């Protein structure tokens, strides 16, 4: 930091993929959503 002279890491803020596990559409209309390589503490904060 150009003032306090501290060493700060830089880790990219989580990205990943979204996969929909479907029982079928001929069986049921339910789904489950997998957020790959993402901790669940961060899943609800997203657009769309």
């Amino acid at each position: 930091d150009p003032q306090t002279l501290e060493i700060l890491d830089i880790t990219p803020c989580s990205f990943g993929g979204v996969s929909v596990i479907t029982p079928g559409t001929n069986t049921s209309n339910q789904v489950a959503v997998l957020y790959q390589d993402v901790n669940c503490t961060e899943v609800p904060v997203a657009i769309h």
Binding site: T11, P12, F15, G16, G17, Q36, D37
Partner: peptide, 23 residues
């Protein structure tokens, strides 16, 4: 099998490393 395992998920610019189905 212990020797064969001791003789041999990274975040990056869009790169992903999916895990295998059979652990």
């Amino acid at each position: 099998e212990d020797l064969l395992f001791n003789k041999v998920a990274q975040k990056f610019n869009g790169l992903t490393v999916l895990p295998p189905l059979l652990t």
